[PDB]
RNA sequence: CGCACGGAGGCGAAGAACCACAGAUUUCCGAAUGAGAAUCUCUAACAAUUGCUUCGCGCAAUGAGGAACCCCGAGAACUGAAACAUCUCAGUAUCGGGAGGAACAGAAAACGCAACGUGAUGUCGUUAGUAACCGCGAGUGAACGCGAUACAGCCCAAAC
RNA sequence: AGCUUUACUGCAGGCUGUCGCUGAG
């Protein structure tokens, strides 16, 4: 399929939305992405 | 149109706005329908002016046959504007009246009856 | 405003493009046309470019992959930053 | 003594007889061939406009709007209906004609409201009412001690509520006793009733 | 064929997309009409009182 | 902070577009180095630079230029 | 130095944080209005409909939203009647159009405890399940008045 | 509930008279 400019600026965000907690963040907070999507198991809008 | 039963012939009517505005500036004359009008049915009117060009025609109908049922005698005028700057209005008139003339008696005298004989 | 120019884009790969074909890679803001890299370049590091090829990246920005002309030497460009 | 107006209302008692019929049955030739909504310059019936609330001034505005006649135009029953709403001919709606007429011609004038409106006749398959519209904001009006009171913002749409003279009448608001038990203060304040 | 899973392998046309106004997937991209706030049909922003019960 | 309101405002027009011109580029110049990863960094400054940048603005605005 | 307690660093007696009011900034799509478009793009824009008009988009208006409330239109069926058609559910559900912080109503071609009486309008209590309707079945169902709340009365058309 | 018909009752539709549009001899 052939993508346009605005639905790539999308799946980019998707993309970095779907990154881990960050190490220092567990300790900031003495202590999961609930947003975790998977290409395969998911399905993005669209 | 429809409450114009004569043509009057373009000298004619050059010759009746010219006694209008002279009507003005030497006696007195009433300016629009209303006042028109009332003086058809007070009497105090002498010769009265019509506009064919009126619309709607609705306020003018009434002239002719009023005018008839108080012997009053009446003239059409093609323009609308030019009666109403021959009685001295920026603006149009549909219809203006002579209550009394002045240095004009003649001539409007002559007027009504060139219309008369205009049958 | 939006500016032009975001940042420099320091990869291996951009890193072979400066010690190689004398290219400077670039983060700008995706509204920017080829031409408007190539000015804002040759403005804030004084040089003069040959040719502005863009791309837009998977990350959201555009980048650009600028080769300066022969005069100038991207890796003295690139070093003073 | 009688008034040159007088004459105009006179005549209109009835539109069939005189020099008023002829006339009609020319205009309706060329409003027949006219829109649904024609804006003029001069109101048909000066005497009626003005005792309705018409002025020859800036900010006022008359149109002539034609709705068909009849009965309501509706669509018979696709699903079960007991042999009560199961008709389509005899079926009417419960807003007069004119009432459409004033509400077609707001519409046109998005801007304006409606301040009043008047029958002008009808032929075999229509009728034809003027409506007189105020530019609320139009300052020509917005100090005019007799016409000011339209340009306050509950007068919004003022047609589109019911709040006409003729909207007024079809709700049922005309009287102030007997009979007017399901109609005043609201139509719908009587759970729709009258 | 049978119109379960041989008839689900087919299945790879592009409807509904989101919506450049309410921002829910469901912009039909054939008939440029959201489903969802019915953008493309409507200035007004779709909404039924069906929705929620009568009473709330 | 190192920059203060006052500062800002005793300058003319053409100073302060000269002091935005040039923290834009001091703020360009980190940014470049944290592209690079470069740990020579003040992390408080990159901040300070941005804000700094708002007063200019702001006061230009303020001031009509 | 948000939630958020890390690491590095920074800001604050030039009185920061924080709070209140006012102002600056305020990307793109969005009523969405130059034109097109799944938030992007193409070459000056109140698009569209209107009013005024220097008849030039010059000056203005409309559009869309909002928890329900409000006003004007369109208008079911399950159900009840131990079936069912009038009736009932119900002018309900739902749909179309629109206003405001409230709406609507409103200064009698009223009432009609019939009077030598009351005196704009909403609303609350009552009048009353009364009068009235109804396969006179099931069911449906006011008003005047009264006691209260709050009170407020005016402007045109025409005659001249 | 779907379906049928000279089941009950109605509703569209078709045909037809009448009124309006509608006028002169
Ligand atoms: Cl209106
Ligand atoms: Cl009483
Ligand atoms: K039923
Ligand atoms: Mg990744
Ligand atoms: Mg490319
Ligand atoms: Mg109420
Ligand atoms: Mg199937
Ligand atoms: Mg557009
Ligand atoms: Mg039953
Ligand atoms: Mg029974
Ligand atoms: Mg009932
Ligand atoms: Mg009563
Ligand atoms: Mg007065
Ligand atoms: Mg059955
Ligand atoms: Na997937
Ligand atoms: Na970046
Ligand atoms: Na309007
Ligand atoms: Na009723
Ligand atoms: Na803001
Ligand atoms: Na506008
Ligand atoms: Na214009
Ligand atoms: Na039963
Ligand atoms: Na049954
Ligand atoms: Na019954
Ligand atoms: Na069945």
Same mark, same amino acid.
């Given at each position: ?46 | ?43 105090? #009117? ?6 064919? &060009?009126?619309?709607? /025609?609705? *306020?003018?109908?009434?002239?002719? $046959? +009023? ?29 203006? #009246? ?6 004009? &008696?003649?001539?409007? /005298?002559? *007027?009504?009856?060139?219309?008369? $004989? +205009?049958? | ?81 | ?194 | ?56 | ?65």
């Amino acid at each position: 399929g052939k993508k346009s400019k605005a639905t790539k600026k999308r799946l980019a965000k998707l993309d970095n939305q779907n990154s881990r907690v960050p190490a220092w963040v567990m300790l900031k907070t003495d202590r999961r992405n609930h947003k975790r999507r998977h290409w395969r198991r998911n399905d993005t809008d669209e | 149109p429809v409450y114009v039963d004569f043509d009057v012939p373009a000298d004619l009517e050059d010759d009746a706005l010219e006694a209008l505005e002279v009507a003005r500036d030497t006696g007195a004359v009433k300016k629009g329908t209303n006042e028109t009008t009332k003086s058809i049915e007070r009497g105090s #009117a002498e010769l009265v002016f019509v506009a064919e &060009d009126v619309q709607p /025609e609705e *306020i003018v109908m009434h002239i002719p $046959e +009023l005018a008839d049922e108080k012997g009053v005698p009446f003239i059409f005028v093609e323009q609308q504007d030019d009666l109403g700057h021959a009685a001295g209005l920026e603006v149009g008139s549909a219809a203006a #009246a002579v209550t009394d003339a002045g240095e004009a &008696d003649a001539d409007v /005298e002559d *007027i009504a009856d060139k219309v008369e $004989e +205009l049958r | 405003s939006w500016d032009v120019i975001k940042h420099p884009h320091v990869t291996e790969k951009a890193m072979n493009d400066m010690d190689f074909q004398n290219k400077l890679q670039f983060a700008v803001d995706d509204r920017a046309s080829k031409g408007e890299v190539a000015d804002a370049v040759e403005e804030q590091y004084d040089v003069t470019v040959e040719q502005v090829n863009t791309q837009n990246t998977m990350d959201g920005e555009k980048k650009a992959v600028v080769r300066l002309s022969e005069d100038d030497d991207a890796q003295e460009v690139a070093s003073r930053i | 003594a009688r008034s040159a107006y007088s004459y105009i209302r006179d005549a209109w008692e009835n539109p069939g007889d005189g020099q008023l019929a002829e006339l009609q049955w020319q205009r309706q030739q060329e409003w027949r061939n006219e829109g649904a909504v024609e804006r003029i310059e001069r109101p048909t019936r000066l005497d009626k406009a003005r005792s309705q609330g018409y002025k020859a001034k800036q900010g006022v505005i008359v149109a002539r709007v034609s709705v068909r006649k009849g009965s309501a135009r509706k669509r018979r029953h696709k699903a079960g209906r007991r042999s009560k709403r199961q008709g389509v001919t005899r079926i009417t709606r419960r807003k007069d004609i004119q009432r459409v007429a004033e509400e077609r011609a707001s519409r046109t004038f998005p801007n304006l409201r409606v301040l009043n409106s008047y029958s002008v006749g009808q032929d075999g398959r229509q009728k034809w009412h003027e409506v007189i519209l105020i530019d609320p904001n139009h300052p020509a009006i917005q100090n005019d001690d007799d016409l000011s009171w339209i340009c306050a913002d509950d007068q919004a749409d003022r047609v589109f509520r019911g709040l006409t003279g003729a909207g007024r009448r079809n709700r049922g608001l005309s009287g102030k006793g007997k009979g007017s038990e399901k109609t005043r203060p609201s139509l719908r304040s009587n759970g729709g009733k009258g | 064929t049978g119109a379960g899973t041989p008839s689900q392998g087919k299945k790879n046309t592009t409807t509904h997309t989101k919506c450049r106004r309410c921002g829910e997937k469901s912009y039909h991209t054939k008939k440029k009409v959201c489903s969802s706030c019915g953008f493309g049909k409507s200035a007004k922003r779709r909404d039924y009182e069906w929705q929620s019960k009568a009473g709330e | 902070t190192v920059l203060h309101v006052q500062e800002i405002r005793d300058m003319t027009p053409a100073e302060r577009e000269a002091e935005l011109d040039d923290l834009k580029t001091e703020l360009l110049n980190a940014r470049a180095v944290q592209a690079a990863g470069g740990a020579p960094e003040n992390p408080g400054r990159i901040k300070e630079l941005r804000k700094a940048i708002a007063r200019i603005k702001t006061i230009q605005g303020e001031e009509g230029d």
